[PDB]
């Protein structure tokens, strides 16, 4: 039985690297080309490169030259793929595959694939909020900090109109400087920067928005002293436009189970536009889930319910969390759904 057995699923942070393995069995490892091919969720197939284990000759797709490394260990008939400087769009199933004897241009035997997830939350700074807002109206951004001492840093917002240079927006200092704030002249009196050290969160409240405020907004954290840093978030687009309905992130309310089979769920309300994606227990719970089509309410905002049936035996032990993602507003909400206790 000719087989390729792959290493297990991996969650990695952006900027880091990943190394997946592929053990060959049931044929002579050094006489056939090995390739790596990836499949981003929902999409098609993309060839990464190939290696001939007998003489370790390699060929890489140009977009992977300098970032992917294919290697082999012939003593254990194993091929490896390392991908460095991981970004957003490297999340995919990675397959190793073997060519038919004597050629390298087809993929005859396939591994079952390795799921590689580039985590969105394992970064120093990640912004929430954004989307479309009417001129004259308001919009709030937030930014979650991890992996550094938030409270000692001076935090900033910086923005970049499309095709333009970086422009500084605001700064807020630390508690030893009374959280003093500073603004660019064109936003003074309209924007407010704030921080919440206990939640490691930075905020930007933007009022009276103008077309000139349209830009990608970056949060930023800076510290000097004796181990300096200058970290940047991921950026979120804010479009001040009167020609598109405004975006709104959802509120999520629990549908607690009643006091055989039990049903519980999440009510996902007050967002615009479509879509939201709903998962349960970060995707661990899928059987018995029904997410209903969204309906537009008289307020002009969508609402839907996601429900799951479970055995009532489990309402004690099992934890139930619905995960709501609304890309147009760049917001994510988790709500634990627990039995109401009297």
């Amino acid at each position: 039985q000719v087989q390729l057995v792959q290493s297990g699923a991996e969650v990695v942070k952006p900027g880091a690297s990943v190394k997946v393995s592929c053990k060959a069995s049931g044929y002579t490892f050094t006489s056939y080309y090995i390739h790596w091919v990836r499949q981003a969720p929902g999409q098609g197939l993309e060839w990464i490169g190939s290696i001939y284990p007998g003489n370790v000759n390699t060929n890489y797709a140009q977009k992977f030259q300098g970032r992917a490394t294919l290697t082999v260990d012939t003593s254990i008939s194993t091929a490896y793929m390392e991908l460095s400087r991981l970004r957003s769009d490297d999340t995919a199933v990675y397959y190793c595959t073997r060519s038919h004897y004597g050629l390298d241009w087809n993929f005859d035997v396939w591994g079952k694939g390795t799921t590689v997830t580039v985590s969105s939350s394992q970064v120093q700074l990640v912004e929430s909020g954004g989307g479309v807002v009417q001129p004259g109206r308001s919009l709030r951004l937030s930014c979650a900090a991890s992996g550094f001492t938030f409270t000692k840093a001076w935090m900033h917002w910086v923005r970049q109109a499309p095709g333009k240079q970086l422009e500084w927006v605001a700064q807020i200092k630390d508690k030893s400087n009374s959280y003093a704030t500073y603004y660019a002249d064109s936003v003074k009196g309209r924007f407010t920067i704030s921080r919440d050290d206990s939640k490691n969160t930075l905020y930007l409240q933007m009022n009276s928005l103008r077309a000139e405020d349209t830009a990608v907004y970056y949060c930023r954290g800076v510290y000097y002293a004796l181990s300096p840093f200058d970290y940047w978030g991921q950026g979120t687009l804010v479009t001040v436009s009167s020609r598109t309905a405004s975006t709104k992130g959802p509120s999520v309310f629990p549908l607690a189970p009643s006091s055989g089979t039990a049903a519980l769920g999440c009510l996902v309300k007050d967002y615009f536009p479509e879509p939201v994606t709903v998962s349960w227990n970060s995707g661990a719970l899928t059987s018995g889930v029904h997410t209903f089509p969204a309906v537009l309410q008289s307020s002009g905002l969508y609402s839907l319910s996601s429900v799951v049936t479970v055995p009532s035996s489990s309402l004690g032990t099992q934890t139930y969390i619905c995960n709501v993602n609304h890309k147009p507003s760049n917001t994510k909400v988790d709500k634990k759904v627990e039995p109401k206790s009297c």
Binding site: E46, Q62, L103, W105, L166, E167, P228, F253, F292
Partner: protein
């Protein structure tokens, strides 16, 4: 406002060659604490800025040694001793000496390559999806953007599984693949035929050119078969009612949700009664698509009221009429009890 100007606007080098970038400020960047807060940043195409240099000449942790900054007063330079492929992008200087903080106008650094290669081969499959019947002859096609002679393979992939080679070199059946699969074509236009469709052939099919690196795949054709069987057995809905959460009541609005789970046939009636008064016009319904596996439906009915109206009434009920129920089923709650 301290203005930061950069020169050049853009530059190009061959890979591995050096680049120099200059920044000029409209006033001295020396802070009163004798520090010069001049920083350098790289913004790779489509990404966030990343910090390279602070206080004129110091590298941040992990910044490679090939980046160096120098200068003083109003004139500053960033030298890249070797421009590697991942160093391309827009470089910005910035000052933190005087409010408002400002950034330079940016210098774009690119790699000029005298050799231009043949473009990647693009594979386009037709149709995007199709629905067919057991026993049908099915043909799907692939068009390549360049002539690839016979160097074309076809694969089958079912959800959650790895692709499986069906045909290689345009027309050769791989070992173990049933003979109802065949391929034809040469040049730019290729065809995969299934002589008589079988239920296990539901899948996405991909073509792949094997002529020139990089090897490239088509975007896929989804092949569906709609089931030609009778109706499933009648399934009564299980019914659940949910009061508004106390979280939502803190918003002035109350939503009451009635769930009808996994019923068949589709016809079902849901009535709401508040204090045993029938309601009309203040509820919305939403129905799932017929389930893939058990062919049932599911339904939510949501009743909306103001918090003020919700708190004035005691008992909330949804009454469900469905063929699988011997009589209408009522699920209710009494506001305030557990």
């Amino acid at each position: 406002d301290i203005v930061m100007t950069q020169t050049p606007l853009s530059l190009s080098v061959t890979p591995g060659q050096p680049a120099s970038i200059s920044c000029k400020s409209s006033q001295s960047l020396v802070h009163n604490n004798a520090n010069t807060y001049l920083s350098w940043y790289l913004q790779k195409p489509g990404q966030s800025p990343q910090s390279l240099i602070y206080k004129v000449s110091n590298r941040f942790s992990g910044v490679p040694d090939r980046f160096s900054g120098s200068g003083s007063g109003t004139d500053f330079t960033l030298k890249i001793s070797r421009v590697e492929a991942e160093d391309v992008g827009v470089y910005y200087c910035g000052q933190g000496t005087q409010y408002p903080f400002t950034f330079g106008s940016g210098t774009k650094v690119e790699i000029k390559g005298q050799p231009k290669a043949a473009p990647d081969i693009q594979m386009t499959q037709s149709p995007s999806s199709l629905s067919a019947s057991v026993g049908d002859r099915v043909t799907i096609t692939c068009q390549a953007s360049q002539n690839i002679y016979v160097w074309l393979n076809w694969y089958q992939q079912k959800p959650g599984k790895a692709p499986k080679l069906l045909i290689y070199k345009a027309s050769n059946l791989h070992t173990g693949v049933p003979s109802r699969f065949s391929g034809s074509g040469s040049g730019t236009d290729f065809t995969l035929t299934i002589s008589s469709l079988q239920p296990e052939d539901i899948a996405t099919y991909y073509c792949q050119q094997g002529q020139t690196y990089p090897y490239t795949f088509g975007q896929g054709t989804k092949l569906e078969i709609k089931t030609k069987g009778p109706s499933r057995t009648v399934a009564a809905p299980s019914v659940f009612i949910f009061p508004p959460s106390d979280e939502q009541l803190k918003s002035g609005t109350a939503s009451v949700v009635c769930l009808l789970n996994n019923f068949y046939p589709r016809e079902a009636k849901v009535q709401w009664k508040v204090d045993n008064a029938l309601q009309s016009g203040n509820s919305q319904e939403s129905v799932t698509e017929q389930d893939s596996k058990d062919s049932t439906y599911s339904l939510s009915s949501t009743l909306t009221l103001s918090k003020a109206d919700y708190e004035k009434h005691k008992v909330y009920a949804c009454e469900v009429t469905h063929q699988g129920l011997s009589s209408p089923v009522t699920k209710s709650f009494n506001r305030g009890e557990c």
